[PDB]
């Protein structure tokens, strides 16, 4: 398990994915041309995971950029590292999906999907021991939502013995352009519960509330939100990109974090929370990091962990610190919150530490939780889906593209079931 193949779909998928490469490249010593201009040597021990070593010291992200709207092409290339991507890995169509999941999953998106699989194959055939894929997309659009899940399902057929990852962004009326986002999301959650092993829920309602209330940004822009996304995507991928004693891979994470196949939606959290500019968050102690990680205010999913039970947890501390002061503080939080960890999964909290701190900070802690409280995010998406579907509003857009009204109700029932399972294990006891 060495190489990972990264894919990004739609405006949101390419925007947060482009930021993900600007971040890990900075940490690994890569420049927008590929030349490794780093100083340390731990930046290369596991560079094969995301980069391909061609030319001389020319590294190239093992990334695949997809979007039905061609306007995203020049956008990504206009960015800082926009020139590092392989130019043949750009697979962009002409007509956008117009927030129409059906267009992205059944019509326009199906015309372009096979062009993307050919790119995936070339990237996958150049791997010594591929360990899986990871996708970045939004659930409220048409390309990332519809063509994403279609592309996911098509890859499951072709690489069934590999791990499927997603960084799925959830819609929110606080950061929203259309009321059909619940339609697109619910139809996508129906696919993510059956065709992915791990999903990092990055809720836009949470990203907004952090900026608007915690960071006190009067009017949060996407850039402010994505500053939180990239920081979370850098921590959750720390152990994949630096060896340590755990030598972690996507499969070891799924085996230990996903007790049940359908319940694979992780609730990521970060600490310290900072906006683009602030420098006052450069002295957080270990006890503050620990408490501030399980704090609901630090979750990237608009959910309260205290309203549920943790199935599993995976804390990641970053920076030069005391591996002991961590191990004792992590055991503390597991007592004052003892009732928030299911008693039928012994030792369900793992702690790792990496000495390389992220850019801008000297110490950081990233949280990955499989909390039954994540049903709150789904009941919210569902309540909105229902409100629209009960009035059968804007259905003709989807049915006109071939979809069947029976398919909406199937996706609704599946999410209601998904919330039921969470409630089961939230109330279950050992006895």
């Amino acid at each position: 398990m060495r190489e990972i193949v990264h894919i990004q779909a739609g405006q949101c998928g390419n925007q947060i994915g482009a930021k993900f490469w600007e971040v890990i490249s900075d940490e690994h010593g890569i420049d927008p041309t590929g030349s490794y201009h780093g100083d340390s040597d731990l930046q290369l021990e596991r560079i094969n995971v995301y980069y391909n070593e061609a030319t001389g010291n020319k590294y190239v992200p093992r990334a695949i950029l997809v979007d039905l709207e061609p306007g995203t092409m020049d956008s990504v290339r206009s960015g800082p590292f926009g020139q590092i991507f392989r130019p043949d890995n750009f697979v962009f169509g002409q007509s956008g999906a117009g927030n129409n999941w059906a267009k992205g999953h059944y019509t326009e998106g199906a015309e372009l999907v096979d062009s993307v699989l050919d790119v995936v194959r070339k990237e996958s055939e150049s791997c010594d021991c591929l360990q899986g894929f990871q996708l970045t997309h939004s659930l409220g659009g048409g390309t990332g939502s519809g063509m994403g899940t279609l592309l996911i399902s098509k890859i499951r057929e072709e690489y069934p013995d590999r791990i499927m990852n997603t960084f799925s962004v959830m819609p929110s009326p606080k950061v929203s352009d259309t009321v059909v986002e619940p339609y697109n999301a619910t139809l996508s959650v129906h696919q993510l519960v059956e065709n992915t092993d791990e999903t990092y829920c990055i809720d836009n309602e949470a990203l907004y509330d952090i900026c608007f209330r915690t960071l006190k940004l009067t009017t949060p822009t996407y850039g402010d939100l994505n500053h939180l996304v990239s920081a979370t995507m850098s921590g959750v991928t720390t152990c994949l990109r630096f060896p340590g004693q755990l030598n972690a891979d996507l499969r070891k994470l799924a085996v230990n974090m996903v007790p049940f196949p359908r319940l694979h939606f992780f609730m990521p959290g970060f600490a310290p929370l900072t906006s683009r500019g602030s420098q006052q968050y450069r002295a957080l102690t270990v006890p503050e990091l620990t408490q501030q990680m399980f704090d609901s205010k630090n979750m990237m999913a608009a959910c309260d962990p205290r309203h549920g039970r943790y199935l599993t947890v995976a804390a990641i501390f970053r920076g030069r610190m005391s591996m002991k002061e961590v191990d004792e503080q992590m055991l503390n939080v597991q007592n004052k919150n003892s009732s928030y960890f299911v008693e039928w999964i012994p030792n369900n909290v793992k702690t790792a530490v990496c000495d390389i701190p992220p850019r801008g900070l000297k110490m950081s802690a990233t949280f990955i939780g499989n909390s039954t409280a994540i049903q709150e995010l789904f009941k919210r998406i569902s309540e909105q889906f229902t409100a629209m579907f009960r009035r059968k509003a804007f259905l003709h857009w989807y049915t006109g593209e071939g979809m069947d009204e029976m398919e909406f109700t199937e996706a609704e029932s599946n999410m209601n079931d998904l919330v039921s399972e969470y409630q089961q294990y939230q109330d279950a006891t050992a006895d």
Binding site: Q131, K252, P346
Partner: protein, 437 residues
């Protein structure tokens, strides 16, 4: 000669293996490249240590060891460490993809892709023996490879080498130093499928080795290296009788005769003393009676349990150093009297004693202080059923909700094997129950 082939499976087995073979070389005067100056033999001979070391024509002594792992990251350090040119290169086998803490991957999907290569390599070592007597398998209960592949290996070895013996050195999982929530599953799964094929298994409780390092060696947060060096000290004590001319436990079959009355309850409890920190180089030298009594203080055991709450079925005392037998008999009579240690009414109530007059060796770089006399008590007591009770409890909290079971079923394994392994473990707890009172 009566050769022994040591097999190491998984990260744990490999790393414990590398520490034991580091120690062996020093106890026998073998350099990291195999060259021993004080051995007239140049092609083999029949010394006591040839059981563990082959010998080329150039006078190089190559361990009779095989190292296996489904990833290369760990065995790649053996191939580049202080003992590069010590082991047989072909006897350092690795794969590309590990078992992801999954028993079913190490035993079915992934393990099948490498099993035949490991057997052919073992067969190569076996064919270079004139009287192979069995294997010493080192592996953890928790990993996917240590549990899955090892179990798969013990099955094939019983079919190919049916007359030979098989001894285990198992690493009982501990939560202070763990790596996966599904280790209870892997532990129960391998024990069930291996209990049939193993003749004698020495469990090592990482929590016990962990406690010893924090209180007897003064190490705040012990590492896998601290544990391994300490583990290699106990292992060496058990394998010493096979590597030096001795009277007690001279071959693998005798381990069964002296320690394993009944096949199923073949899990003896090891206890080792003294363990003194290297920062105390000028410590008072403890006597035979003080270390013989130390073997009954539960704080020195390799598995956490209460032997006072269990009957003894066998007890071997392996002394090493400046030990006079008269002081050993006296110290045994002191234990047989003042101590209320109960033996089962059907076994002999005596103690077997072996003495190896070589001073214990400490690895140059470790945390253990040189001592003039140490002892290792192997004892088969029913109190070790408590260790099976703790594992069985975890494999119960989770399986009751069928947690993580889908990861095993999706790797070519039937759900029924969980209920089989647990019922077999339940059956083991009653075996210890009936032997005691």
């Amino acid at each position: 000669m009566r050769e022994c082939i040591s097999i190491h499976v998984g990260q744990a087995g490999v790393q414990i293996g590398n520490a034991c073979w580091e120690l062996y070389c020093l106890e026998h005067g073998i350099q990291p490249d195999g060259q021993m100056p004080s051995d007239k033999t140049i092609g083999g001979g029949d010394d006591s240590f040839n059981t563990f070391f082959s010998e080329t024509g150039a006078g190089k002594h190559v361990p009779r060891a095989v190292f296996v792992d489904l990833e290369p990251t760990v065995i790649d350090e053996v191939r580049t460490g202080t003992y590069r040119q010590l082991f047989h290169p072909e006897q350092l086998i690795t794969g590309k993809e590990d078992a992801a803490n999954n028993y079913a991957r190490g035993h079915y999907t992934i393990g099948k892709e490498i099993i035949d290569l490991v057997l052919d390599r073992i067969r190569k070592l076996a064919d270079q023996c004139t009287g192979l007597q069995g294997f010493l398998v080192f592996h953890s209960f928790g990993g996917g490879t240590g549990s899955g592949f090892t179990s798969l290996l013990m099955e094939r070895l019983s079919v190919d080498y049916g007359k030979k013996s098989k001894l285990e050195f198992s690493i009982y999982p501990a939560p202070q130093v763990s790596t996966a929530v599904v280790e209870p599953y892997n532990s129960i799964l391998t024990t069930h499928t291996t209990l049939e094929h193993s003749d004698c298994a020495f469990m090592v409780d990482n929590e016990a080795i962990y406690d010893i390092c924090r209180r007897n060696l003064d190490i705040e947060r012990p590492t896998y290296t601290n544990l391994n060096r300490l583990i290699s000290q106990i292992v060496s004590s058990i394998t010493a009788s096979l590597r030096f001319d001795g009277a007690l436990n001279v071959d693998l079959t005798e381990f069964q005769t002296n320690l394993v009355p009944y096949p199923r309850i073949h899990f003896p409890l090891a206890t080792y003393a003294p363990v003194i920190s290297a920062e105390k180089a000028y410590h008072e030298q403890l006597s035979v009676a003080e270390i013989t009594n130390a073997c009954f203080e539960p704080a020195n055991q390799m598995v956490k349990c209460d032997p006072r709450h269990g009957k003894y079925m066998a007890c071997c005392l392996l002394y090493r150093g400046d030990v006079v037998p008269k002081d050993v008999n006296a110290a045994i009579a002191t234990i047989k009297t003042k101590r209320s240690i109960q033996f089962v009414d059907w076994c002999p109530t005596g103690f077997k004693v072996g003495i190896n007059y070589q001073p214990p060796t400490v690895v140059p770089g470790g945390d253990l202080a040189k001592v003039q006399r140490a002892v290792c008590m192997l004892s088969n007591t029913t109190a070790i059923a408590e260790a099976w009770a703790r594992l069985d409890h975890k494999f119960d909290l989770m399986y009751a909700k069928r947690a993580f079971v889908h990861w095993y079923v999706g790797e070519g394994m039937e759900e029924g094997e969980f209920s089989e392994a647990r019922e077999d473990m339940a059956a083991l707890e009653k075996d210890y129950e009936e032997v005691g009172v």
